[PDB]
Amino acid sequence: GLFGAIAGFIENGWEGMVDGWYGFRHQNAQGTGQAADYKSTQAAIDQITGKLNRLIEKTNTEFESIESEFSEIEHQIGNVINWTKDSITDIWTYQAELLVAMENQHTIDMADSEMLNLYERVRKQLRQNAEEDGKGCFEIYHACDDSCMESIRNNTYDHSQYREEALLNRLN
Amino acid sequence: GLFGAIAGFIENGWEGMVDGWYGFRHQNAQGTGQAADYKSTQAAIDQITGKLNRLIEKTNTEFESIESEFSEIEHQIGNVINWTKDSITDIWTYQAELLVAMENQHTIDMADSEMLNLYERVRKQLRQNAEEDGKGCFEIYHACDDSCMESIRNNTYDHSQYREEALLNRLN
Amino acid sequence: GLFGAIAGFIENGWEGMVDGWYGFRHQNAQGTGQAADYKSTQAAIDQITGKLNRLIEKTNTEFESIESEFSEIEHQIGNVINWTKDSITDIWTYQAELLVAMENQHTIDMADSEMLNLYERVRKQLRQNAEEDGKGCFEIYHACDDSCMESIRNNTYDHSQYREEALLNRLN
Amino acid sequence: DKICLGHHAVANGTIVKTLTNEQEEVTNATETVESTSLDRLCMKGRSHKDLGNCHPIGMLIGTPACDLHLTGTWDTLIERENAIAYCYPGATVNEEALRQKIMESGGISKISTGFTYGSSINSAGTTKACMRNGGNSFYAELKWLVSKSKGQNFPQTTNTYRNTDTAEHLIMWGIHHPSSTQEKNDLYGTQSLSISVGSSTYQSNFVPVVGARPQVNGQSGRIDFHWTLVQPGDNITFSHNGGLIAPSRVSKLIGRGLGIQSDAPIDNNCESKCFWRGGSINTRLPFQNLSPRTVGQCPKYVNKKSLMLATGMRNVPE
Amino acid sequence: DKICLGHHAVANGTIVKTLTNEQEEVTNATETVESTSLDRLCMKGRSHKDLGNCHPIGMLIGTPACDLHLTGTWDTLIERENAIAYCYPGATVNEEALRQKIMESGGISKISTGFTYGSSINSAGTTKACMRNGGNSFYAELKWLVSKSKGQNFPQTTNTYRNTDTAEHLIMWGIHHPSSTQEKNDLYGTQSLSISVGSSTYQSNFVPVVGARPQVNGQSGRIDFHWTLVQPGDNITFSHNGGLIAPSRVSKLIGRGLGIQSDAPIDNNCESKCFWRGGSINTRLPFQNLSPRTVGQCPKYVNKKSLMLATGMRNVPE
Amino acid sequence: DKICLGHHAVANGTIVKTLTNEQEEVTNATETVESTSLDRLCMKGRSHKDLGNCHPIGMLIGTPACDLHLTGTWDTLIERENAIAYCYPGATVNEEALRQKIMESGGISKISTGFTYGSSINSAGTTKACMRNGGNSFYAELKWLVSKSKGQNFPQTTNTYRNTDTAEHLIMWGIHHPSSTQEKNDLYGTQSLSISVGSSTYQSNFVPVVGARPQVNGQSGRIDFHWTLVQPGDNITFSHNGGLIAPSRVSKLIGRGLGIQSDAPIDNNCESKCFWRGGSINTRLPFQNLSPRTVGQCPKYVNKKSLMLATGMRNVPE
Ligand SMILES: *[C@@H]1O[C@H](CO)[C@@H](O[C@@H]2O[C@H](CO)[C@@H](O[C@@H]3O[C@H](CO[C@H]4O[C@H](CO)[C@@H](O)[C@H](O)[C@@H]4O)[C@@H](O)[C@H](O[C@H]4O[C@H](CO)[C@@H](O)[C@H](O)[C@@H]4O)[C@@H]3O)[C@H](O)[C@H]2NC(C)=O)[C@H](O)[C@H]1NC(C)=O
Ligand SMILES: *[C@@H]1O[C@H](CO)[C@@H](O[C@@H]2O[C@H](CO)[C@@H](O[C@@H]3O[C@H](CO[C@H]4O[C@H](CO)[C@@H](O)[C@H](O)[C@@H]4O)[C@@H](O)[C@H](O[C@H]4O[C@H](CO)[C@@H](O)[C@H](O)[C@@H]4O)[C@@H]3O)[C@H](O)[C@H]2NC(C)=O)[C@H](O)[C@H]1NC(C)=O
Ligand SMILES: *[C@@H]1O[C@H](CO)[C@@H](O[C@@H]2O[C@H](CO)[C@@H](O[C@@H]3O[C@H](CO)[C@@H](O)[C@H](O[C@H]4O[C@H](CO)[C@@H](O)[C@H](O)[C@@H]4O)[C@@H]3O)[C@H](O)[C@H]2NC(C)=O)[C@H](O)[C@H]1NC(C)=O
Ligand SMILES: CC(=O)N[C@@H]1[C@@H](O[C@@H]2O[C@H](CO)[C@H](O)[C@H](O[C@]3(C(=O)O)C[C@H](O)[C@@H](NC(C)=O)[C@H]([C@H](O)[C@H](O)CO)O3)[C@H]2O)[C@H](O)[C@@H](CO)O[C@H]1O
Ligand SMILES: *[C@@H]1O[C@H](CO)[C@@H](O[C@@H]2O[C@H](CO)[C@@H](O)[C@H](O)[C@H]2NC(C)=O)[C@H](O)[C@H]1NC(C)=O
Ligand SMILES: *[C@@H]1O[C@H](CO)[C@@H](O)[C@H](O)[C@H]1NC(C)=O
Ligand SMILES: *[C@@H]1O[C@H](CO)[C@@H](O)[C@H](O)[C@H]1NC(C)=O
Ligand SMILES: *[C@H]1O[C@H](CO)[C@@H](O)[C@H](O)[C@H]1NC(C)=O
Ligand SMILES: *[C@H]1O[C@H](CO)[C@@H](O)[C@H](O)[C@H]1NC(C)=O
Contact F19 A103 (CB under 8 A): yes
Q: Which residues of A touch C112 (CB under 8 A)?
A: none
Beta-sheet pairing, D76-79 with D48-50: parallel
Contact B124 C133 (CB under 8 A): yes
Mutate which of B6, B79, B87, B172 to disrupt the A interface (most A C-beta within 10 Å)? B87
The CA distance from B112 to D196, in Å, is 79
Residue A15 Rama label (left phi>0; alpha psi -120 to 50; beta): alpha
Residues F111 and F127 in one domain: yes
DSSP label at residue A140 = E
Provide the angle, in degrees to the nearest 10, between the axes of the packed helices A75-126 and A38-56.
Answer: 170
Q: Which residues of C touch E9 (CB under 8 A)?
A: 12-15, 17
Burial of F39 (0-12, 13-18, 19+ CB in 10 A): exposed
Q: Which of A40, F307, A99, A124 is nearest to B1 (CA)?
A: A40
The CA distance from E6 to D96, in Å, is 70
Q: Which of D178, D206, D173 is nearest to D190 (CA)?
A: D178
The DSSP H or E segment spanning A81 is helix A75-126
Burial of E208 (0-12, 13-18, 19+ CB in 10 A): buried
The CA distance from C62 to A90, in Å, is 11
Ligand with minimal distance to D8 CA: 8
Angle CA A28–A29–A30, to nearest 5: 90
Q: Which of F101, F96, F112, F95 is nearest to F255 (CA)?
A: F101
Do E3 and C149 contact (CB within 8 A), yes or no? yes
The string of DSSP letters for D149-216 reads STTSPPPPEEEEEE--SSS-EEEEEEEEE-SSHHHHHHHH-SSPP-EEEE-SS-EEEE---------B
Contact A77 B79 (CB under 8 A): no
DSSP label at residue B24 = E
The CA distance from C141 to C167, in Å, is 8
CATH number where F286 lies: 2.10.77.10
What total number of domains does chain E contain? 2
Residues E257 and E130 in one domain: yes
Three-state DSSP state, B101? helix
Mutate which of D103, D229, D293, D300 to disrupt the B interface (most B C-beta within 10 Å)? D300
The CA distance from E15 to B49, in Å, is 19
Cα B97 → chain centroid: 21
Q: Which of D251, D258, D292 is nearest to D59 (CA)?
A: D251
Q: Which residues of E touch C111 (CB under 8 A)?
A: 7, 312-314
The CA distance from F114 to D153, in Å, is 47
E-F contacts at Cβ under 8 angstroms: 41
**Technique that determined the structure:** X-ray
Q: Which residues lie closer than 8 Å to C72 by C-beta, 6 or more apart?
A: C78
Q: Which ligand 5 atom minimizes the distance to the CA of D215?
A: 28
Give the residue numbers spanning the domain of B33.
1-172
Q: Which residues lie closer than 8 Å to D126 by C-beta, 6 or more apart?
A: D135, D136, D137, D138, D144
Residues F118 and F246 in one domain: yes
The CA distance from D285 to D287, in Å, is 6
Residues E85 and E124 in one domain: yes
Do F237 and E215 contact (CB within 8 A), yes or no? no
State the maximum Cα–Cα separation within chain A, in Å, rounded to a whole number.
92
Residues F39 and F55 in one domain: no
Angle CA E135–E141–E142, to nearest 5: 80
CA distances from B74 to A13, B80, D295 (A): 65, 10, 21
Do F251 and F221 contact (CB within 8 A), yes or no? no
CATH number where A109 lies: 3.90.20.10
Q: What resolution in Å is listed for this PDB structure?
A: 2.4
What total number of domains does chain A contain? 1
Q: Which residues lie closer than 8 Å to F91 by C-beta, 6 or more apart?
A: D201, F224, F225
Q: Which of D224, D281, D288, D254 is nearest to D88 (CA)?
A: D224
The CA distance from D25 to D248, in Å, is 71
Give residues (CB < 6 A) around ligand 7: E 214; F 162, 233-235
Burial D229-243 (b: 16+ CB within 10 A, else e): bbeeebbbbbbbbbb
**Ligand 7 atom 1 nearest Cα:** F235
CATH number where F222 lies: 3.90.209.20
Q: Which ligand 1 atom minimizes the distance to the CA of A79?
A: 61
Amino acid type, E83: A
Three-state DSSP state, D247? strand
Q: Which ligand 8 atom minimizes the distance to the CA of D312?
A: 1
Contact E197 D212 (CB under 8 A): no
The CA distance from F226 to B95, in Å, is 45
Residue F214 in contact with ligand 6 by CB distance below 6 A? yes
Contact D21 C50 (CB under 8 A): yes
Single residue among F264, F279, F299 that ends a domain in this structure: F264
Q: Which residues of C touch F104 (CB under 8 A)?
A: 79
Beta bridge partners of F176: F223
Amino acid type, E187: L
The string of DSSP letters for chain F reads -EEEEEEB--SS-EEE--SS-TTEEES-EEE-EE-PPBSSEEBTT--EEE-TTB-TTHHHHT-GGGTT-SSEE-SEEEE-TT-BS-SSS--BTTHHHHHHHHHH-SEEEEEE------TTEEEEE-EEEEESSSSEE--TTEEEEEESSTTSPPPPEEEEEE--SSS-EEEEEEEEE-SSHHHHHHHH-SSPP-EEEE-SS-EEEE---------BTTB--EEEEEEEEE-TT-EEEEEESS-EEEESEEEEE-S--EEEE--SPEETTSB-SEEETTEE---S-SEE-S-S-EEES-PEE-S-S--EEE-S-B----
Q: Which ligand 7 atom minimizes the distance to the CA of E215?
A: 9
Beta bridge partners of E249: E112
CA distances from B97 to A50, A101, F17 (A): 14, 17, 9
Closest F-chain CA to D206: F209
Residue C138 Rama label (left phi>0; alpha psi -120 to 50; beta): beta
Residues E4 and E63 in one domain: no
Contact E205 D212 (CB under 8 A): no
The string of DSSP letters for C11-25 reads ---BTT--S-SEEEE
Residues D167 and D150 in one domain: yes
Q: How many residues does chain B have?
A: 172
**Ligand 8 atom 12 nearest Cα:** D30
Q: Which residues lie closer than 8 Å to E298 by C-beta, 6 or more apart?
A: C63, E273, E274, E281, E288
Distance (Å) from the alpha carbon of F38 to chain D's nearest alpha carbon:
33
Burial of E102 (0-12, 13-18, 19+ CB in 10 A): buried
**Ligand 3 atom 42 nearest Cα:** B69
Beta bridge partners of A23: A36, D6
Beta-sheet pairing, E41-42 with E266-267: parallel
Is the Cα torsion angle A40, A42, A46, A52 positive or negative in sign?
Answer: positive
Which of F158, F200, F234 comes nearest E212 by C-beta?
A: F158
For C26, phi then psi, to 5°, come to -120, 160
Residues F257 and F318 in one domain: no
Ligand with minimal distance to E310 CA: 9
Beta bridge partners of D227: D172
**Ligand 6 atom 11 nearest Cα:** D234
Amino acid type, F261: Q
Q: How far does residue D44's CA lie from ligand 3's centre (Å)?
A: 26
The CA distance from C151 to C158, in Å, is 8
The answer to whether D209 contacts chain E (CB < 8 Å) is yes
Q: Which ligand 4 atom minimizes the distance to the CA of D128?
A: 19
Residues F230 and F279 in one domain: no
Beta bridge partners of C109: none
Helices in chain C by DSSP H: which ranges?
38-55, 75-126, 146-153, 163-171
Ligand with minimal distance to D312 CA: 8
Q: How far does residue F203's CA lie from ligand 7's centre (Å)?
A: 17
Q: How far does residue A106's CA lie from ligand 8's centre (Å)?
A: 19
Q: How far does residue D8's CA lie from ligand 8's centre (Å)?
A: 14
Provide the angle, in degrees to the nearest 10, between the axes of the packed helices A75-126 and B75-126.
Answer: 20
Cα B171 → chain centroid: 37
Three-state DSSP state, E252? strand
Give the residue numbers spanning the domain of E116.
47-264
Distance (Å) from the alpha carbon of F173 to chain D's nearest alpha carbon:
18
